[PDB]
Design a protein around this ligand. Sequence first.
Ligand SMILES: CCCCCCCCC(=O)O
Ligand SMILES: CCCCCCCCC(=O)O
Length: 133
Amino acid sequence: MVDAFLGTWKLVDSKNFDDYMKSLGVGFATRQVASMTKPTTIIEKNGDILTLKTHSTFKNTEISFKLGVEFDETTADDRKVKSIVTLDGGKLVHLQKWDGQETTLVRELIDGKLILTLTHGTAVCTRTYEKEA
Ligand SMILES: CCCCCCCCC(=O)O
Ligand SMILES: CCCCCCCCC(=O)O
């Protein structure tokens, strides 16, 4: 039920990403570079398995997961977390848990754009991605 999320997406707007990174303890030099990076996110499916790639000039990540099945993840900032991704209200909700901490990465399609909302602590970042042909 994931299908309009699938494809290649490019970052076209970012709000409060520094706040989000700082909440997670990312160092200032990394936050500089990340504030000027525009990743490409690729979301593909094969049966029940999704693969989500995030590519940039700085750092790259890739995860594969089944919806609703927990997986181990090592994040771009090197947190070792327990993750689960589900559909909720048509949104792709990714929850990461580590050391009793929790962050959510929520993706929603609005007017054909993919809106990624990142929440940790009180920090709320909104990143907008537009689809590549
Ligand atoms: C500081 C942790 C950053 C983790 C990944 C954030 C993802 C951002 C993105 O995909 O646009
Ligand atoms: C996977 C590309 C993400 C680029 C921006 C965020 C990097 C954050 C970090 O390294 O701590």
